[PDB]
Each structure stands twice: as structure tokens, then as C-alpha cells.
């Protein structure tokens, strides 16, 4: 057993039929030493008395908010959560596997620039009693300050007649070096709590590898009796632009003809019912492309 945070603990269990579980001794954080009663969750049933309480934790029915009282007054709280180890593996029932870039991938992170900010999102089929706790750092031996905010619902969709709930969180590196050569990776650690169930997930990466710029800005068409295309860098991309350069790809889409350039403009051939789209990528590093920015042709 170990403490996740104040008055919150985790019990690691080997999850198998008729497993005996672990014996846990809960101590009421209180000065007084007599006339003490324990309870669980909302039930008034007195489970024991005294300074301490011994319990065998083997099923979720044995977990929950253990509370000690003395004269009706609430003295101390102690919440117990369970971490299933199924045949030597921790449980991963909460989050849906994205299977990209590889199996057993639950977290996907991105960054719109080298500023030091980035965003990580994950999916789940759960809708209630769901809580996440996010932490991050650069380096494991000696970690560096990385501040993470709160995880909140970003979208809701249906996939295979079962609802999908997307969560997202924003973080930021305390003292960033946007132009530097990242030597140590970012470490992201997530605690997931569904009811009393405890699970935690992880991801490691450099920022330069997860870059995905925003689509080009102000996409315009200038015809000529065939068409001249022009755009601008996005607002979120890093600055100055002569340092953090971008490259682009122009597509006319029946077929899809594509060209590449480092300029903010290009000339192409337009056709009826066609569409012109453009996306961007870091000019010097092969990171992720940007979503298309489109303008109907003709």
C-alpha cells in the first residue's frame, strides 16, 4: 500500500479468483486515543472501534472511503483504491487502445510549436465517476519543472454503436528553450480512477517529434484567363519565421495532383468541381503534417 495523495491510498492486488488479498491497517489521524468508531462510505454500520482498524482487502466491496468518528465528529478520512494485476500485468480497462503508432498506445500528444506547450488527448467508453490526474516532467533521474493543467472533455462521438468520450489536457514547460536540441525526453504520467479502480498510464517523447502546425492562414486564389495561390503562416506557429521555417504541399482534388515548395504562394491549374487544399510541415525536421486548409475552386 502507498499514498497517492492526502488521505488517498492505493492497494496493489494480484487479481485472480478467490485471491485472499492483502491485510491493511488503517490508522485514524487524530490525537485522542479512545472512543473511536469506523465506517465505510455513507453506511452508518460500525465496522470497528479503536485507534486502528484491520481489514482484509480482496474485493471492491472492501474498498471505499473509510472514516473514523468520535462523538459524531468526523476525525479523519482514508480512501482506498485498488490496482488490479491480472496474470502479472496491470489493468488497462479504462482507456481505449489507439493502436497508433503501435499497440498498447493510450496517450497521443501534440504541439503546435516549439514554445514549450503541448496537448495530450485520450479516449474512453466511460461516462461517470471518472477522474484523471496529470503530471509531467523532463527527465526521470532529475526531473525538470513541467506544469500540467486539468483534464476535461474535448469531444463526444459514437464508434461502433458505443459512445466515445475524448479527454484532453494542456501542459507547459517551465523554462523552455524552443531553439535548442532536446537531449532529455518529456515524461507524462497519468493517474486514472474509475469508481474505486486505480490505473496509471505513461508516455515519453521529445517535443520536436510531436509537432503538428496549424493549417495555413488566409488561403486566397488569384485567377488568370491558371490560378495563383497564396497563404500565410498560422498564428500559433513559433516566431520569428526566418528561424522556424515551414514547407508546404498544395493539392488539387477524379484524382489528386500534388506539388511542394518553401514559398507562401504557388501557381497551379484549376478545374470545375475541384478543390484546392494546402498543409504545412516544419521545413527542416520531418514531423507531422498540418491538417488541410481548403478553398473550393471555380
Amino acid at each position, epitope marked *: 500500500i502507498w499514498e497517492l495523495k492526502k488521505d488517498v491510498y492505493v492497494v496493489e492486488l494480484d*487479481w*485472480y*479468483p478467490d485471491a485472499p488479498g492483502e491485510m491493511v491497517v488503517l490508522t485514524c489521524d487524530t490525537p485522542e486515543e479512545d472512543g473511536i468508531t469506523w465506517t465505510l462510505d455513507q453506511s452508518s454500520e460500525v465496522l470497528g472501534s479503536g485507534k486502528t482498524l484491520t481489514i482484509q482487502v480482496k*474485493e471492491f466491496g472492501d474498498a471505499g472511503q473509510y472514516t473514523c468518528h468520535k462523538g459524531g465528529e468526523v476525525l479523519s478520512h482514508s480512501l482506498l483504491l485498488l490496482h488490479k494485476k491480472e*496474470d502479472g500485468i496491470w489493468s*488497462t480497462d479504462i482507456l481505449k487502445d489507439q493502436k497508433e503508432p503501435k*499497440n*498498447k498506445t493510450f496517450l497521443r500528444c501534440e504541439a503546435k510549436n516549439y514554445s514549450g506547450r503541448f496537448t495530450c488527448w485520450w479516449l474512453t467508453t466511460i461516462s461517470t465517476d471518472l477522474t484523471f490526474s496529470v503530471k509531467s516532467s523532463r527527465g526521470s533521474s532529475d526531473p525538470q519543472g513541467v506544469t500540467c493543467g486539468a483534464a476535461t472533455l474535448s469531444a463526444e462521438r459514437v464508434r461502433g454503436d458505443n459512445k466515445e468520450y475524448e479527454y484532453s489536457v494542456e501542459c507547459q514547460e517551465d523554462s523552455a528553450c524552443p531553439a535548442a536540441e532536446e537531449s532529455l525526453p518529456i515524461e507524462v504520467m497519468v493517474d486514472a480512477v474509475h469508481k474505486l479502480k486505480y490505473e496509471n498510464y505513461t508516455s515519453s517523447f521529445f517535443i520536436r517529434d510531436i509537432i503538428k502546425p496549424d493549417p495555413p492562414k488566409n488561403l486566397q486564389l488569384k485567377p488568370l484567363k491558371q490560378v495563383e495561390v497564396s497563404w500565410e503562416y498560422p498564428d500559433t506557429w513559433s516566431t520569428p519565421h526566418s528561424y522556424f521555417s515551414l514547407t508546404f504541399c498544395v493539392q488539387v482534388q477524379e484524382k489528386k495532383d500534388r506539388v511542394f515548395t518553401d514559398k507562401t504562394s504557388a501557381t497551379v491549374i484549376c478545374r470545375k468541381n475541384a478543390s484546392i487544399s494546402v498543409r504545412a510541415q516544419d521545413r527542416y525536421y520531418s514531423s507531422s503534417w498540418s491538417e488541410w486548409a481548403s478553398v473550393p475552386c471555380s
Partner: antibody
Amino acid sequence: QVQLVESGGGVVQPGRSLRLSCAASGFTFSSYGMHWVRQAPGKGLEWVAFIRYDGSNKYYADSVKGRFTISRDNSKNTLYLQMNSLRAEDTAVYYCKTHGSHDNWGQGTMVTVSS
Amino acid sequence: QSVLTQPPSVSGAPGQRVTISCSGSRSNIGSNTVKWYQQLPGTAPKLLIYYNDQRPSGVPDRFSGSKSGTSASLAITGLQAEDEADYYCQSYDRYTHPALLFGTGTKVTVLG
């Protein structure tokens, strides 16, 4: 006392279907996952499929993907395995094993695919 | 989509020691644990070792397991006629997570 009992096996021609049943007892069936394992006479073990505690996610071996279908009914404490488009190489004994450290195995039921 | 490598046959006289290897890769044995089973001619497999080296109840102490890097080993100290049987090692792959990886099997034979 944990116990598992397979049923539904027998003989069948190729191409036809068959449904297998593993009756559980002695523990909290709905709180654990379950496997399906087979072994040809005098050969080694080969994993077939697996299903989680809540039936949320199901997994299959690539030699039976799209053909077999696994299911459970926690209300009656049983585990199923629907085998469709059977093939000759599927001839074997089919056990149900629990998922966990101290796992348990049933007696198994024979499945013979032969014209 | 993977298998573990065990020696087909191992042999030894009563009272002697014998070892059974379970070789794999970094994806499976190098990142996961190892189980050992005992299958007697006319029954289903019985669990001998779990989490590499642990012994359940009802399994003597002579059955001792281990794991090193990409390979594991089950040691039977002090043979007996009853120990003559097939043995299988099982583990998982870091990417075919729940799928079970069984070994080739090992026929233990008592001679002398």
C-alpha cells in the same frame, strides 16, 4: 473450490458451426477475465481467444480471426465460444482457463472436424 | 503471432537434477514474466510456477524456477517417477498483450 466444466463439443463436418460452453463455479465469475485454449492430441498448447471481465473487449488468435466468436453471460456464470466455418486443423481439445496468477483449467471437451 | 522455444526432450535418473529452458526475445520474456505448467498424459495442465519463481500451494519445493534476461529455466531437484511428464512455459508479448505465448513443450523422461 474453483471448478470449470466444458460442454458443447463433439463431431462435425467441415464448414459447419458449433457452440462451446464452459460452466464456472466457486468464485466471482463477473469480476475476472476468461481464456479459451486448445491442444491437438499429443501436441502442444495453442491460444484461441480471450474476453475481459465486462465483455467489453474481445481478442482472437489470427488463425481463427473472423471465424470464431467469444461471448459470456455473467448472469448465469458461463463462458461461450461460437465456432463458425470450422476447418479440419481445428480438431483438438478445448479448455477454458481463467486469467490471473492462480489460474485454473477445466477438463476440456473434444472437438473432431472430419467428413 | 509468436512462440517460445523449449527443448523437446530432457532426461535424468532418479535423485538427479535437470533443467528446462524457455527462450524468447526482448518483446516477451525480456519485458514480461513466465509461468510453468505440468501436463500429465491423461489430464489438463497444472500450475507449477507463476511470476517466474513463486510456488503455489500443493507444489513441492523441489520445483524451482527462474528468469534471466530473455530466457527462463525450471529446475527439478531430486527426480521421481511421478515427475515423468510434459512441461510448458507461458508468457505474454509486449504488443500482443492478452494473447498467451506457450512454449514448444518438453517431454521429461525418467531413465535408469
